[model samples]
Target chain A: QVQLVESGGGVVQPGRSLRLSCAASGFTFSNHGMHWVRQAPGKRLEWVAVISYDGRHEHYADLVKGRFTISRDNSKNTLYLQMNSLRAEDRALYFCAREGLSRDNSGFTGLIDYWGQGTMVTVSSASTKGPSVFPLAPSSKSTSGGTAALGCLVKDYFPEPVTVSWNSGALTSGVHTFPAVLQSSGLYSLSSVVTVPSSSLGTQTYICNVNHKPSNTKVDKKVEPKSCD
Target chain B: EVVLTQSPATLSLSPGERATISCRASQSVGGYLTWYQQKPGQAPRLLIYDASNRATGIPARFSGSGSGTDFTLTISGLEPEDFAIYYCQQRGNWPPITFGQGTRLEIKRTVAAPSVFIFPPSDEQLKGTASVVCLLNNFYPREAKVQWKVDNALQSGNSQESVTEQDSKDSTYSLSSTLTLSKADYEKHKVYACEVTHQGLSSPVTKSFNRGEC
Candidate 1:
C-alpha cells in the first residue's frame, strides 16, 4: 500500500521559478523510485523525470534540459522538483508515481504503478478552449477486407490537451491520432483517422469522441456511411 | 494510479478491545472502498464493502465508514479469532485497483513456525483402506498451504476430506488435511509426500513417507 501526495501548485508567472513536493508513505520510500509525469494540454502523457528512492539515481526528460532538477529527502519521505525559468508550456497537471517492474522481465521497461492526485500548475495567461469536432464518412471507393478510412477534425482548442477517441474505444487498434497543429490564431487543431470494416460501412455508424480538459467539455460527432463503393 | 495508504502498521490489543484502522486514498474512490481480513495461514476474507456495507457472513462488530479520500475499518469487541491482518482496497473508473499495505493486529505474537508431519495410513488402513493425514502443529497466526503428492506427481481432484484449524491451548494454531487412496494404488505409488508453506518458513517444508511392509 504505497501512497504519494503531491502538494502545492499555483499560477506561476512565465520565466519565474517554482518548487513542488510529493510526500510518500506506507512502504519504505528508499526501496523504490519516484517518477514525475505531466498531462499535456493537447497531447499524450509525458514523462518528466525520475529519482531513485535511495536518492542516488536520477534521470530527466529531454525537454527539462537544465530547467528542472529532481531531488529527494529520505528522512522526510518526500521528493522535490525545482523549475527555473518556467515557460507557458509548463502549465499542466503533474503526477508523482511509483516505479514497478515491467510485465516481461526481459523488456526492462520501468512501469508506473502508483500515482498521486496530481498538482496542477498553471502558467499565467494560459488559454482553455474546447475543440469543435467534425467526423467525416469515408469518401467513395471503400475497399476490400472492410477497408474504410474515417476521420475527425478537432479544431480551435487551446491549452493543448484534448482526447480524441473513436467508436467508444471500439476502434483503438484501427485508430491513429496526429499531433496537434498550431493554427495561425494560437489555437490548436488535431486530426484523428480510424479504419473500420467497409462491410459495415453501410449500416454501422462511427462516432468521434472528444474530451477537453481545463475546459471540462466533452463532444461526440457521428457519421453514417452511405455505400460509396 | 489511485493509491491507498493504511496507517499505523500494526495494532496491539487484547481480546474484547476495540481496534480501528484507517485507509486514505490519493483521490476520491467513492463507494468502491473494500476491506478484507486474513489470518497468517488463511486466505483473505471479505469484510466490508461499498464503503460501509458489511459483506455476507461478516460480523456486526466489523464496520467500515467514510467516503472521498478517507475511510475507516473498525473492529468492536475483538474476539480471539479477530487477531489478523487487514487490508483496504479501492477502485473506480481508473484501474490498477489499489490496496493499502495491510495492518496486522496481534495480541502479542511471534514467528512460531508450524512443523508439518505426514501421518501414514494406519497398520490395517495402509494395506486395506486408509486416509493419510498431514499434521501442522504449534504455528502461531493461522494456517498452512498443504499439497498432497503421490511419489512425485502432485495429487489433485479429491482433496481436503478435512482441512481444519484448531486453536492451541498456547494460543497457537494447528491445521491438518487428509488424503484418501485405495490400498492397491497406495502400494503402487511407493511414496507419499506432504508439503506445507507458511510465512514462518523461508522456503516450503516438505516431508515424504515410503510405504513399508504391511
Candidate 2:
C-alpha cells in the first residue's frame, strides 16, 4: 500500500523559520504532485503549496505569496515546504496530499487520493518538546530444525511509532513479520521477526535496525548467530 | 479565492434526527466541493466529494447537493454514532483549496480520560539500544494530539502514527507512538516522554521514563 508521511513540524518562534517534509513510498513518486495543506486549531483547512512530481510545476497560496517555498527531490521521493518570517498564525497542522494520477477524459485532475499524517507546528513562546528515542532490544530464538527467528521489540516512545527491519550477514531469504499490540497504558508495543532458514544462515552477525524517521536516526541490536543457540 | 463558510457553529442532537449543514463559498465553486467527517483523535474521512457524489462506502442517509456558491450536506435521520464534526472543502481551484469552519454535532454523553502508558525496551534484548512506545486507549471524541520530548527538549525524528481505531461497543479510539534510542543516550539518563492533548482534557496527559526506570 502507498503511504505518505509528514515530518519536521514542532514549535518555532515568531519570525523564525520552519521546514516540513513529506516522504512517499510504495508507489512511483514521479507520477503525481504533492500538495501541502494547513489547518489552524479549531479552524478550517487551507491550501498552502504544491510541488509536481516531475519537478516542473509549483504553486503557492496568495497568503504565503512570496515568503513560502515548495520544492521536491524526485530521487528521494520526497517533497519539502519551508516558510520564513513565521507568525503565530502560521503555527498549525501541516500535511501533504498526493494528487490523483488518473484524469477524466476532459483533462480535469482528480481529487487528492492520499494524505500524510499531520505535523503540528506551534508558534508559542514556550519551549517546544524535544523528541526522544526509546531503546530497542533484539532477541533470537532457535525454532524447529536449524532455522532461527530474529525478533526486535520496540515500544514506549511518542509522537509516532517506527519501522523495524532485520539484517543478517549476506542472508536475504527470510520471512518477516510485524505485529503491534495495545496495552492498557494506552501505549503501543511492536514486535518484528525475521525467520531465516538453515541454508541461508551463516556465522555472520545479525542486526535488528529500528529507524526513527523525520529525525532519521537508527537504533539497532547486533547479535552473532551463536547467541541464538 | 474560494472561501467556504459552514452554518450553525454547533448542532446538539440525538440519534434519528436529520442534520442539515450548509457551505456557502465566496464565489461560484460549481461542483468542486467535498465533505468530510472528523471525530476526536482521528483523521478526517471523506464523505462526499465532487459536489454531490457520495464517496466510497458512505451511508445512504448521508447525501450532498448544490453547486455554484451554495451547497448542502444533509445527514438524513442521523445515526447515534453520527454525532461528530463536519467540514466542507472546495477544490474548484488547483493552487488554493479551502475548507469551511467545522460544524460540530454534539450529542449529550459522558466523556472520559484516555488510558495512557509508556513501556521501555526490555533488558535481555537490550543490545545497547531500544525503542519505546506510548499508547492512548479508549478515548471519546477521537481528537487527540501527541507530542514527544527528549531531555525536556523538543524531539523530532523518524516516527510512525497509527490511524485511530474505534471500538464499536463504545465508539472510543485508540492510538500509539514509538521512539528509538541509542545505548549512549540511554546510559546518559536521557529522559523521554509522550504528551497527549485531547478536547476532553484540561491539561495535556504525559507519561515519561528515565534510565533504569524500565
Candidate 3:
C-alpha cells in the first residue's frame, strides 16, 4: 500500500502553538511534493501550502491567516506543518498531500496526488502524538524559469531516468544534467541538475522524467523564455 | 471583497436525479474555482480542482466545469451518497476567500423557520453520523485549524480531506467539509461543532439538534 502516516504532539493546551507532520514510508518523499491543508471545527477545508521534495523551495496561498509555516525534511520522507500563537481557529486536523502533474497546463494549478492520512495537533498547555513537538517551518518553492524560478523545483528534488534537451535542439548555451543531493523529508538527500546558460534566457526548453521501478514515472518540462510582455 | 452569487437557495431532487450548483464571482477571477459537498456533521471533501478537473479518487458521478469567476459543480446520476448542501468558492483573486450563500440540495422540513445548522432534518434516514460543513474565511500570513466534536467526543480516527489554499493574498477563496455520524449517535441529541483558529483568536461556532425534530 502506498501509505502516508503523520506524527505530532496530539493533545494541545489552548493558547499555545502546535506542530504536526505526515511521515511517509512506503513511498519516497523526494520523488513527490507534499501539500498541507487544514479543517477547522465547523468550517470547510483550508488550503495551507506545499513543500517540494528536493528541499529547495516553498509556495504559500494568500488567504492563510496568523502564525503558520510549512516545511519538510527530505531524507526522512516527511512533510511538516505547524500553527503558531495558537488560537481556537487553529483547532482542526491537518492533511498532507502529494503534488502531481496536471493534463491541462493553463488550468493546472499545481496538483496533489498521494496524501498522508492527516495529523491532529491540539494546541493546549500540554502536547500529544509524540514527545516534544519541534519547530515545523522551512522555506521552499516551485523553481519555474521565467519571472522568478518555476517554484516547482522538480530539478532540486528527485533524480532520474532524467533526459534533458532543448525544444529547438540548437545548442544555445550548452545544457547539462548531473548527480546531486536530493533530500527526502530532511533526512535523505539525492538528486540531479541540468544547468543551461541563464542567457539562454527564454529560449531553452528542458524536460525531466523520473522512472521509479515497477512503472510509476513522473515527467516535467520547463522553458527558459516566457513570452515577452 | 468579491461578491459571489449562488442560485436557488434549495434544490428538490428525486433521490438520484442529477443536480447542479452555480457560483458567479463579482469580477474576473480566472480558473481558481473549487467545489465541495457537506453531508452534515463531517468535514468538507474537495470535489473539483482548477475549475473543472476532478481530484483523484472522486466518484465518476461527480464533476465540475466552467472557469474565470463563473463556474458550475455538477453531480450526475446521483448516488445515495450524493445528497446534502453544495457550495462554490473562488480562490482566484486574493486575501478574502469567499463562499456562495450555499444551495440546500436536500428536502427541507416545513415545520421550523429556516435556520443555519449542520445535519439536515432527514439525516437519520441517511445514517447515524451527523455531518457539518465549514468554509475558510479571508485573512493571511495565517495558521488556522478546523476541528469537529459530536457531543464532546473528538472524532480523529476517521478520514479528513483538504486542498492547497491559494498562495497569493489577492486570490479569491472557498473550501468546505462534511461531518458524518453513526445512527445510534445521531439519535442521541448530539451537538456538532466547528472551531477555527486564525492568528491569535480561535473562535468556535456550533449547530446542534435533537433527532427527528428541529
The ten-residue window of minimal lDDT in model 1 chain A covers A102-111
Q: Quick one: best lDDT, which candidate?
A: 1
- TM-score of predicted model 1? 0.34
Worst 10-residue lDDT window, candidate 2 chain A: A127-136
**What TM-score does model 1 score on chain A?**
0.55
**CAPRI verdict (incorrect, acceptable, medium, high) for model 1:** incorrect
Q: In model 3, where do residues sit more than 4 Å from their true spots?
A: A25-28, A60-66, A102-108, A113-117, A124-229, B1-12, B36-46, B54-60, B84-104, B107-214
**For model 2, what is the alpha-carbon lDDT of residue A18?**
89
Q: What is the full ranking by lDDT, best candidate first? A: 1, 2, 3
Question: What clash count goes with each model?
Answer: 7, 47, 108
Per-residue alpha-carbon lDDT of candidate 3 for residues B1-214, written as tens digits (9 for 90 to 100): 5667777766755446778788888987788776767655444556787788887688877878777767887888766567666767665664344566677665322221111113232322343333333333332322345666666776574313232232232322222233445556556654555544444343444434333333
Report clash pairs, candidate 1.
A1-B101, A41-A160, A41-A161, A42-A160, A42-A161, A146-A198, B41-B143
| Best by the DockQ measure | 2
lDDT measured at residue A226 in model 2 versus the true structure, 0 to 100: 31
In angstroms, the error of model 3 at A195 is: 73
Q: Please write out the lDDT profile of model 1 over residues B1-214, one tens digit for every residue.
A: 7778888777767788999999998888777787877564333455777779886678899889999999999999989889878878664423334567788686745657865545455443343544565555557656468888887899986445222233324555555555667777776877778888888988888867667521
Interface RMSD of 1: 30.2
